[PDB]
Structures are given as structure tokens and as C-alpha cells.
């Protein structure tokens, strides 16, 4: 039905996401929710070219994440 389901199935894989501020932030997905509440273990940040100002841990809210990348190059959803 939904494609949040797809996200849910992914586990332990690096993915960049561009936020409303505008930073390319590669991190591990961890326990993904139905509300898209992501959590990243290792990450690279640019506080407002991408300047390096990185922190290790972070807890993401789902409303901010517009795009996601590099889980794994494969398309499977229905089960």
C-alpha cells in the first residue's frame, strides 16, 4: 500500500538525505518508523559547498527528510 513500508524493511545501510537547511548527511537508518522517524549512527554535517562540521549521533524527525539515497541498488516492496 505505502512506500514507508519499503523504508521499514531496510536495515544497516548508509543513505544521504538533504534537509530543509541543505546538507548532504550520510548515515545508517536504524529502527525506521511508520512516521519516518530516522536515527543515524555516524554522520557528516554542515551548519548554516558543504563545510565539514560533523557530529556522531543524531535523532531525525520524519517531516524534514525529503529525499533518501544509497540503501541498496534493488527494488522490492510487496510481500
Amino acid at each position: 500500500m505505502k512506500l514507508v513500508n519499503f523504508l521499514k524493511k531496510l536495515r544497516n545501510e548508509q543513505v544521504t538525505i538533504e534537509l530543509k537547511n541543505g546538507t548532504t548527511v550520510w548515515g545508517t537508518l536504524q529502527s525506521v518508523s511508520p512516521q519516518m522517524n530516522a536515527i543515524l549512527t555516524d554522520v557528516k554535517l554542515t551548519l548554516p559547498s558543504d563545510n565539514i562540521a560533523s557530529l556522531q549521533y543524531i535523532n531525525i524527525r520524519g517531516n524534514t527528510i525529503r529525499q533518501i539515497i544509497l540503501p541498496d541498488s534493488l527494488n522490492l516492496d510487496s510481500l
Binding site: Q30, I58, N59, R61
Partner: protein
């Protein structure tokens, strides 16, 4: 910065977290409670401004934060 491999929001209750807002003002505070929208009740709020270079400081609130304008919370120190 020390922080263990936590799974979910329930396991990381009662910790000093940074919080980021939509306009770009940085916060800090100990996470007291939980909710559906992640309306995280901060134990003591020290708000910070950055003009559109250098970070400023305030000390007014010990707040109940609302979940609409939050970007992403970050753990500071246990």
C-alpha cells in the same frame, strides 16, 4: 562525546539532548517525557541564536517543546 548504541526514543529517556528548530535556533535540555508528535519536555532550556558566524545564548525557559518545528534532536552528554 559519549553515547551508547540506543535503539528507540523510550531507551534514551532522561538524557541531555540538543534540539534544532526550523528557523535555525539551537537548544539544549534533558529529555523528560514522550508523545505521538515528539513533544519532548526539556528539563532546562538554554536557547541560542545565529544571525543570517557566532552563536548567542539565552536562559528563560524550562520548557515543553512542540513537535511541529523541530528538525532533529542530538544527544549531548549523559
Amino acid at each position: 562525546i559519549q553515547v551508547a548504541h540506543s535503539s528507540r526514543l523510550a531507551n534514551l529517556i532522561d538524557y541531555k539532548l540538543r534540539v534544532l528548530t526550523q528557523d535555525g535556533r539551537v537548544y539544549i535540555g534533558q529529555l523528560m517525557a514522550f508523545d505521538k508528535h515528539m513533544n519532548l519536555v526539556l528539563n532546562e532550556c538554554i536557547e541560542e541564536r545565529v544571525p543570517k558566524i557566532k552563536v548567542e545564548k539565552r536562559v528563560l525557559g524550562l520548557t515543553i517543546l512542540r513537535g511541529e518545528q523541530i528538525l532533529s534532536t542530538v544527544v549531548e552528554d549523559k
